[PDB]
Amino acid sequence: MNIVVLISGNGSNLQAIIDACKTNKIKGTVRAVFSNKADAFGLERARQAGIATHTLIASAFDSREAYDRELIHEIDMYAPDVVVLAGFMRILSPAFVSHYAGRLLNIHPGTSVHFVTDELDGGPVILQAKVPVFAGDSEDDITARVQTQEHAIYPLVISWFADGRLKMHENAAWLDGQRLPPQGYAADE
Amino acid sequence: MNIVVLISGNGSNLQAIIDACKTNKIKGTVRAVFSNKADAFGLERARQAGIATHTLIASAFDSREAYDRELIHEIDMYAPDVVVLAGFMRILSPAFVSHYAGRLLNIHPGTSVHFVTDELDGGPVILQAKVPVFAGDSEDDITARVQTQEHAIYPLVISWFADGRLKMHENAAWLDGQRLPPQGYAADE
């Protein structure tokens, strides 16, 4: 329950998380969407789904500290159990990253989903998904195929988080009771 | 000059103001657009035109005291010279109105725009326009003749304000020094 999702531009990964709560695939509601850009079509998707958005573009702010003091304020209003970055595109800061520790998540390409931390590595990866270099590469495909894996795996890890079976304990990810190791994935032991 | 418009729906009014300031008839700028409602199309108008949306849903707040304290907080970062309500369906507090004093404008469907001075939507009217109903109009045919006056009258009145020509000294709307009559109008006679 209590998912808040940060985003910039178009929102394909967010679509995937609104339909997965909608259909009860993740036990939680996405209680608000934020973007550091107006234009962000992912906003149009949040309002079609009828969820509260908040574009906070900087330049409206005097400093970066000012802006993140504020983004943390409008985010914590919604009492978030998870804060999921899903295309957000802003250089995160020691205070943001520290504020949401163990409830902050991100997705990066090739495609994988990790806990965001201060560790030099970016923080523990939770779930990875490799896509073939296999020949029917109707070039657009390159990314478009990673995208499909993104829409598949981010809802699945957010869902484990909600059901209380993904914890981050001591800069290590922990699925269903035991430690994930550097690349992690499924049925536990 | 720094405008923020508060909305709850289609936003065609938001749009006349965005257009009027774009084509310079208002000497000002729409810094942000706020909303009590998650799905209000006028939010889409604000995104196509580049303006930062912000939407606070009453049910995310526990006390109405809290909603208003938050909505004022978030309007103030934009530092508004005039905050214009355009379709905002919310019952306002004294504290919200007290706070935006003679900077808060409101419009109504017969058309009369006015200074909101009191938590039961009272204040000095600045300008009135009456529309003709003819033999055979439909309720739509009327409502749109009305909509078109709001789009012609609300901007013009924000022009006079964002030009110093309009001010409000003790529940009295004054344009150029002269206290306006209770029906508004703008010149004399």
Close Cβ partners of B63 (under 8 Å, ≥ 6 residues apart): none
Separation CA A89–CA A40 (nearest Å):
12
Strand B2-7 relative to strand B29-35: parallel, antiparallel, unpaired? Answer: parallel
Residue that is written with structure tokens 């938050």 in the block: B70
Nearest CA distance, A33 vs chain B (angstrom) = 10
A54 in reach of chain B (CB within 8 A): yes
Question: Which stretch of DSSP H or E encloses residue B2?
Answer: strand B2-7
- Please compute Rg for chain B using Cα positions: 16
At residue A98, the 3 state secondary structure works out as helix
Mind telling me how many Å the CA of B36 is from chain A's nearest CA? 9
As a three-state string, the secondary structure of A9-77 is CCCHHHHHHHHHHHCCCCCCCEEEEEECCCCCCHHHHHHHCCCCEEECCCCCCCCHHHHHHHHHHHHHH
Q: Are B124 and B117 in contact (CB under 8 A)?
A: yes
Cβ contact A125:A173 at 8 Å: yes
Name chain A contacts of B31, Cβ cutoff 8 Å.
Answer: 60
Q: Are B42 and B7 in contact (CB under 8 A)?
A: yes
CATH of the domain at A16: 3.40.50.170
B50 to A39: CB separation less than 8 angstroms, yes or no? yes
Contact B47 A56 (CB under 8 A): no
The annotation status of B149 as a binding-site residue, yes or no, is yes
Q: Is residue B126 within 8 Å of B115, Cβ to Cβ?
A: yes
Non-local (6+) Cβ contacts of A164 within 8 A are: none
CA distances from A177 to A102, A164, A181, B127 (A): 16, 10, 13, 68
Q: Which residues of A touch B55 (CB under 8 A)?
A: 52-54
Domain containing residue B22: 1-189
| Residue A34 with chain B: CB contacts under 8 Å | none
Q: Single out the residue of A8, A9, A40, A5 nearest to residue A19, CA to CA.
A: A5
Residues of chain A positioned with their CB less than 8 A from the CB of B42: none
Q: Does the active-site annotation cover B54?
A: no
The minimal CB distance from A60 to the residues B43, B70, B78 is found for B78
- Distance in Å, alpha carbon of A77 to nearest chain B alpha carbon: 8
Any residues with CB less than 8 A from the CB of B161 and at least 6 apart, and which? Answer: B82, B105
Determine the residue of chain A that is closest to B51 in CA distance: A38
Could you give the number of structural domains in chain A? Answer: 1
Q: Give the 3-state secondary structure of residue B136.
A: coil
SS3 A188: coil
Q: Which residues of A contribute to the annotated binding site for (6R)-10-formyltetrahydrofolate?
A: 64, 89-92, 106, 117-121
- Find out whether B163 is annotated in a ligand binding site: no
Residue B58 DSSP symbol = G
**Phi and psi dihedrals of B147, rounded to 5?**
-40, -45
Angle value at C-alpha B54, between A92 and B122, nearest 5 degrees:
150
Resolution in A, one decimal? 2.8
B18/A contact by beta carbon, under 8 A: no
